Amino acid sequence: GKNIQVVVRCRPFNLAERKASAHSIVECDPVRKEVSVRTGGLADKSSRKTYTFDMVFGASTKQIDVYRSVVCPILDEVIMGYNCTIFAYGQTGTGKTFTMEGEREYTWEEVPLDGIIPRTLHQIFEKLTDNGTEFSVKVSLLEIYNEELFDLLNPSSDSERLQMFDDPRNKRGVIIKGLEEITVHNKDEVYQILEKGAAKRTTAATLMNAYSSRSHSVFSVTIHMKETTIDGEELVKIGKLNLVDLAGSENININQSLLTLGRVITALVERTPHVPYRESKLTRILQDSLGGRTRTSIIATISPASLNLEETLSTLEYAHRAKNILNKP
Numbered sequence: 001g002k003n004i005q006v007v008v009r010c011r012p013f014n015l016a017e018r019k020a021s022a023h024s025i026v027e028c029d030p031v032r033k034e035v036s037v038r039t040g041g042l043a044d045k046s047s048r049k050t051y052t053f054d055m056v057f058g059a060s061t062k063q064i065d066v067y068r069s070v071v072c073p074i075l076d077e078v079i080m081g082y083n084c085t086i087f088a089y090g091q092t093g094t095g096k097t098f099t100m101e102g103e104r105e106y107t108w109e110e111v112p113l114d115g116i117i118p119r120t121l122h123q124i125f126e127k128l129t130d131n132g133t134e135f136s137v138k139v140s141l142l143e144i145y146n147e148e149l150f151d152l153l154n155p156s157s158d159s160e161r162l163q164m165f166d167d168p169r170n171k172r173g174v175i176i177k178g179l180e181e182i183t184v185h186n187k188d189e190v191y192q193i194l195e196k197g198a199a200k201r202t203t204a205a206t207l208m209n210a211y212s213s214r215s216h217s218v219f220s221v222t223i224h225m226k227e228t229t230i231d232g233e234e235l236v237k238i239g240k241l242n243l244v245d246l247a248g249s250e251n252i253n254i255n256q257s258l259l260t261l262g263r264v265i266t267a268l269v270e271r272t273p274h275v276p277y278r279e280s281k282l283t284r285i286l287q288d289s290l291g292g293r294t295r296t297s298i299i300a301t302i303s304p305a306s307l308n309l310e311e312t313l314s315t316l317e318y319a320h321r322a323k324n325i326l327n328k329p
């Protein structure tokens with residue numbers, strides 16, 4: 001699977017983990033692209049399990065580093081008119097959202113702590129403006145909670161589950177009816193769009209108890225591009241990027257949707273003819289991207305802490321089952 005990259009990002013051990021008297025049980029090796037965990041736990045030390053992936057981000061890794069390495073070559077493809085997807089997958093609290101969104105002249109914000117989504121909107125605007133491309137950008141943001149779809153961007157949207165239909169004009173496509181798409185007018189409008197997104201998600205975790213923790217959220221960008229050549233020829237392209245912050249790993253039943261995604265990715269990597277797209281909402285919505293000429297990436301997040309051993313081992317196993325990479329001698 002040249003086209004499907006699986007990478008691992010170990011976040012810093014944290015304060016809560018110290019106070020529980022946890023210790024680091026995971027060793028990352030960016031050069032050998034390995035992650036080792038002592039599976040025995042504490043005094044085992046005979047129990048070391050090692051995994052190999054496309055990339056392993058050690059401690060020195062910053063937000064820009066994940067961006068240049070995972071995202072930039074995918075936006076290249078998106079800008080050439082392809083449809084791509086990037087997943088963040090892992091235990092709650094391990095960095096899926098920090099990676100996808102991150103945190104905030106830069107006066108009130110920490111741009112170094114910006115994640116994938118705002119950096120993506122920035123490059124889109126910077127690259128397309130520089131090369132003289134006439135363009136327009138729109139985004140939708142939806143969440144999936146217990147197999148029901150909710151629009152995070154509808155101002156008047158109460159509650160209401162959106163409805164998804166097959167699209168008989170495309171056998172791989174899908175139509176989410178009523179889905180709001182904002183037009184993005186500048187680099188910084190993303191921040192306000194993520195704000196509106198969060199307010200709304202917060203509401204729905206009250207009147208609903210759909211915790212962003214237990215939900216998938218799908219942030220989709222569509223770019224309409226027109227290039228004019230030397231002679232005044234017009235070249236028209238439509239790119240699409242899906243940035244997905246998955247439901248927490250920990251119970252591995254949105255548990256079933258995660259697993260379906262796993263089989264979908266494994267069938268793609270292995271080229272087996274049976275690809276179970278229809279078995280979850282997430283994979284139906286995404287079949288268009290995953291199934292064509294494309295690039296796909298999973299950022300598997302983990303905590304280094306001994307207290308997280310089981311969920312960390314499971315996340316590693318999931319990512320390994322996804323794209324199986326033999327360990328080096």
Ligand SMILES: Nc1ncnc2c1ncn2[C@@H]1O[C@H](COP(=O)(O)OP(=O)(O)O)[C@@H](O)[C@H]1O
Pocket residue numbers: 010011012090091092093094095096097098099103301
């Ligand atoms: N690579 C990282 N570096 C520094 N802090 C991080 C990193 N990843 C996560 N955190 C912090 O850890 C907490 C959990 O991260 P978050 O992305 O919300 O987890 P998840 O989305 O996987 O539940 C957040 O407070 C975040 O600020």
Ligand SMILES: [Ca+2]
Pocket residue numbers: 010011012013024059304
């Ligand atoms: Ca660490």
Ligand SMILES: [Cl-]
Pocket residue numbers: 026027028059
């Ligand atoms: Cl380490």
Ligand SMILES: [Cl-]
Pocket residue numbers: 010011028057058059304
């Ligand atoms: Cl690390």
Ligand SMILES: [Cl-]
Pocket residue numbers: 059061062063
């Ligand atoms: Cl960091």
Ligand SMILES: [Cl-]
Pocket residue numbers: none
């Ligand atoms: Cl600039």
Ligand SMILES: [Cl-]
Pocket residue numbers: 182183184185
């Ligand atoms: Cl607008």
Ligand SMILES: [Cl-]
Pocket residue numbers: 185189
């Ligand atoms: Cl605007």
Ligand SMILES: [Cl-]
Pocket residue numbers: none
């Ligand atoms: Cl506005």
Ligand SMILES: [Cl-]
Pocket residue numbers: 263276
């Ligand atoms: Cl199946």
Ligand SMILES: [Cl-]
Pocket residue numbers: none
């Ligand atoms: Cl089945």
Ligand SMILES: [Cl-]
Pocket residue numbers: 320
């Ligand atoms: Cl295995």
Ligand SMILES: [Co+2]
Pocket residue numbers: 072076
């Ligand atoms: Co480039």
Ligand SMILES: [Co+2]
Pocket residue numbers: 126127130
């Ligand atoms: Co420039």
Ligand SMILES: [Co+2]
Pocket residue numbers: 126129
């Ligand atoms: Co500029």
Ligand SMILES: [Co+2]
Pocket residue numbers: 144146147148254257280281282
């Ligand atoms: Co589902």
